[PDB]
Amino acid sequence: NLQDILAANAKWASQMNNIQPTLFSPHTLFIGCSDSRYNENCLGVLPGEVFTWKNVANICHSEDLTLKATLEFAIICLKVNKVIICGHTDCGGIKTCLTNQREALPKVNCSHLYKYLDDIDTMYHEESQNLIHLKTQREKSHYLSHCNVKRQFNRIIENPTVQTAVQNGELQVYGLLYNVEDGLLQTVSTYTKVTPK
Amino acid sequence: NLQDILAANAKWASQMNNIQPTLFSPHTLFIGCSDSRYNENCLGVLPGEVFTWKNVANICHSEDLTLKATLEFAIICLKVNKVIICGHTDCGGIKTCLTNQREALPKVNCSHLYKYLDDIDTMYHEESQNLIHLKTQREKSHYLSHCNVKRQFNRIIENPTVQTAVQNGELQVYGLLYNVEDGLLQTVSTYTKVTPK
Ligand SMILES: [Zn+2]
Ligand SMILES: [Zn+2]
């Protein structure tokens, strides 16, 4: 099966050499879920344009080293002019909390996934009094995916590296939601030099 | 900007829906560098097939919560049968250490990127005598890209979730190196049921 992968890669690479010879300086940092159904390509860019941080449920803890390190590198060293936090509908991590199945993770040897999803569960609990007005699971799941984009966006825009670059007119931050059913991006939040602060 | 991004996404989504409407569960966890020049699409397989953890210099600390959570979700919940750790040549984080410019990061308000890159710099220092015979930065950078694949691979295969699945013959782990000059994957390491670590 590795030989299948190497074969698939060689085919892909020969085609890629022909199509984009200049590929063989990004302007955007894309932060998205590890979910297999999308990546930075949903932005309608070519390779080389988008530097990507992809993690389970696109979680951006404010005091996390990887977040701070990634924002510093993208903004100060690579000099991206866009940071995009892009969640998506039908997110596994969110569903696991929404359907109260996080409790069951330690039983099946997923104690670290359990701990990792703490932030998502905390959001889900905070949101109980808003969820109750939505009738179907589809609606609740959509709401929490949207809500998670706001949640992580608000932490990114408090980051001092981000505030400095934005204030200087060198950076804009967008919070987007990818709809898996149609491939469309939807605007959740924006933070630019001119947005009210 | 955002207007351009939404238009490019809309156009992209239409082009995807016209070719493959049926695109709207993965077999592979891909772990790669945040680098803009490659992602899971280098494997040459269908979209929705590869769940992806993408971080700066593809660092996998054994005790990192994200590593454990990501492996537990992929192997136990998604039941992927392949874990791929895929580094690449011309890696910025490696070149920062190799060329001794990591020490410059605190001055430019990147002290967290500085701390994040400790593992890469430790590898660089550990390998310094091994690097003497290589007279060009290109050769050194290649050596260190390869070394880093094995370094992160070695930690992944010691994770209990990974070891259980591999010993059960339900998982294979591949260490790969993506050459940015030609789009081709080099095999660095493999771990299977019948292969020693
Ligand atoms: Zn998700
Ligand atoms: Zn890299």
Numbering used by the authors:
A (entry chain A), B (entry chain B): 17 to 40, 49 to 221
Copy out sentences from the published article reporting this entry, exactly as the authors wrote them.
Carbonic anhydrase (CA; EC 4.2.1.1) is a zinc containing enzyme which catalyzes a reversible reaction to form bicarbonate from carbon dioxide and water. The budding yeast Saccharomyces cerevisiae encodes a single copy of CA, termed Nce103 after the non-classical export pathway where it was identified for the first time. Nce103 is an efficient β-CA who shows high CO2 hydrase activity, with a kcat of 9.4 × 105 s-1 and kcat/Km of 9.8 × 107 M-1 s-1. Nce103 contains all conserved residues of the active site in the plant type β-CAs, and a relatively divergent N-terminal region.
Thus, we constructed the truncated version Nce103ΔN13 which enabled us to determine its crystal structure at 2.04 Å resolution. The overall structure of Nce103 contains two molecules in an asymmetric unit. The missing electron density of the N-terminal 6× His-tag, residues His14-Ser16 and Pro41-Gln48 of each subunit indicates their high degree of flexibility. The N-terminal arm is composed of two α-helices that extend away from the rest of the molecule, making extensive contacts with the other molecule in the asymmetric unit. Two subunits form a very tight homodimer with a buried interface of 3,027 Å2, bringing the two zinc binding pockets close to each other. Each subunit contains a zinc ion that resides at the interface between two subunits, with three coordinating residues (Cys57, Cys115 and His112) from the same subunit, and a water molecule Wat263A/Wat260B as the fourth to complete the tetrahedral coordination. In the substrate binding pocket, there is a flat trilobed piece of density, reminiscent of an acetate molecule, which is an analog of the substrate bicarbonate. Compared to that in PSCA (or Can2), the acetate molecule (ACT) in Nce103 is far away from the zinc ion (3.53 vs 2.65 Å). The two tunnels in the homodimer point to the opposite directions towards the surface. It is worth noting that this tunnel is funnel-shaped, widely open toward the solvent but has a narrow gorge (cross section radius ~2.1 Å) in the vicinity of the acetate ion, suggesting that the linear CO2 (with a length of ~3.3 Å) molecule can freely diffuse toward the active sites, consistent with the diffusion-control catalytic mechanism of β-CAs. Nce103ΔN13 shows almost the same activity as the full length Nce103, whereas the activity of Nce103ΔN50 has been completely abolished.
